[PDB]
Amino acid sequence: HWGYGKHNGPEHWHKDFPIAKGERQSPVDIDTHTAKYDPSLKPLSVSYDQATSLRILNNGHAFNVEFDDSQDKAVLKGGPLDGTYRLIQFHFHWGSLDGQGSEHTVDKKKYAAELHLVHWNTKYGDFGKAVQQPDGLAVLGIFLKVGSAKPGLQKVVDVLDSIKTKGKSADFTNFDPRGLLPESLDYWTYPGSLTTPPLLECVTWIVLKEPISVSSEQVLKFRKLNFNGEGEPEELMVDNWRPAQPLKNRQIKASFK
Ligand SMILES: NS(=O)(=O)c1cc(NC(=O)Nc2ccc(C(F)(F)F)cc2)c(O)c([N+](=O)[O-])c1
Numbered sequence: 001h002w003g004y005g006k007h008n009g010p011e012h013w014h015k016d017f018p019i020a021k022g023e024r025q026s027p028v029d030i031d032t033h034t035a036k037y038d039p040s041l042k043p044l045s046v047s048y049d050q051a052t053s054l055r056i057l058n059n060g061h062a063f064n065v066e067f068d069d070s071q072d073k074a075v076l077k078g079g080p081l082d083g084t085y086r087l088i089q090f091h092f093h094w095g096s097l098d099g100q101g102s103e104h105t106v107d108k109k110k111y112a113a114e115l116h117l118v119h120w121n122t123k124y125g126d127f128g129k130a131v132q133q134p135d136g137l138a139v140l141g142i143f144l145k146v147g148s149a150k151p152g153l154q155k156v157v158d159v160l161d162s163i164k165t166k167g168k169s170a171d172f173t174n175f176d177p178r179g180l181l182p183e184s185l186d187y188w189t190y191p192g193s194l195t196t197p198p199l200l201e202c203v204t205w206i207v208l209k210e211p212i213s214v215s216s217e218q219v220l221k222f223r224k225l226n227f228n229g230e231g232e233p234e235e236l237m238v239d240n241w242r243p244a245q246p247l248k249n250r251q252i253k254a255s256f257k
C-alpha cells in the first residue's frame with residue numbers, strides 16, 4: 001500500500017485515491033504577499049484545560065497521540081469556524097534533515113517538522129461522519145524550527161523508544177497539549193484536505209504564523225522511529241510529508257496584517 005517511498009510515495013497516490021488530483025488538496029505554499037487580511041476573522045479559541053490524552057501509537061506512517069473525544073473536553077472554536085470542534089489526536093510530519101520536513105511552506109521556506117492537531121465538528125456526531133463533510137475537520141498546523149528545546153515536548157520524545165515499530169502503542173495519560181502552542185495565535189486559513197490517504201477534502205486548515213523551537217536532539221529522536229513492524233527490515237521513519245499542491249481556485253486568508 002501507500003507510503004512515502006520511491007515506489008509508493010505521494011506521486012503514486014492518485015492511482016488508488018484519484019481525489020489526490022482534486023480541487024482543494026493540501027498542503028500548499030503560503031505566499032505571504034498574496035494572502036488576504038480578513039478583518040472579519042475572529043480570534044481562535046483554544047480550550048485544552050480539560051484534555052484527556054489516552055495513548056500514543058506508531059501507525060506505520062507517523063506517531064499519533066490520541067485523546068478522549070466522547071465529550072467536549074478539549075475544543076477549538078472561533079477563528080473561521082462555526083461550531084465546536086473536538087480534539088481527537090495530534091501527530092507530526094518531519095524530515096531526514098533540518099531543512100525539510102514540514103508539509104505547508106511559507107514563501108517556499110520549509111521547516112524541520114509540522115505539528116497537526118486534528119479536531120472534528122461535533123454537529124456530525126462522530127469522526128467517521130465528519131470526514132464526509134466539507135466543514136467536518138479543523139486541523140491546527142504548527143511549524144517547528146530547530147533551536148532551543150521545547151520543554152513541553154520532552155514527554156513525547158521520551159516515550160518514542162517504546163513505540164519504535166509499526167503497530168506498537170503505549171499508555172500516554174495526563175499529557176497537556178497546551179505545552180506545544182506558540183505565544184501568538186495569529187494564523188492563515190484556507191479550505192483543504194487530509195494530507196495522507198484517503199485525502200478527503202474535509203478540512204478547514206488553520207496554520208499558525210509563529211513556529212515553536214525544538215532542539216536538534218529532540219527532532220533526532222523522531223527520526224529513530226521505524227516505518228516497518230517488529231522483525232521486519234528496518235526503514236527509518238523520515239520524510240513523511242507530502243509536497244505542496246496547486247492552490248487552484250482558493251484564497252489564503254490571514255488573521256493579521
Ligand atoms: N496529515 S493529516 O491529514 O492531518 C493526518 C490524518 C490522520 N488520520 C486519518 O486520516 N484518519 C482517518 C481518516 C479517514 C477515515 C475514514 F473516513 F476513511 F474512515 C478513517 C481514519 C493521520 O493518521 C495522519 N498521520 O500521519 O498519522 C495524518
Ligand SMILES: [Zn+2]
Nearest residue numbers: 091093116195
Ligand atoms: Zn498531518
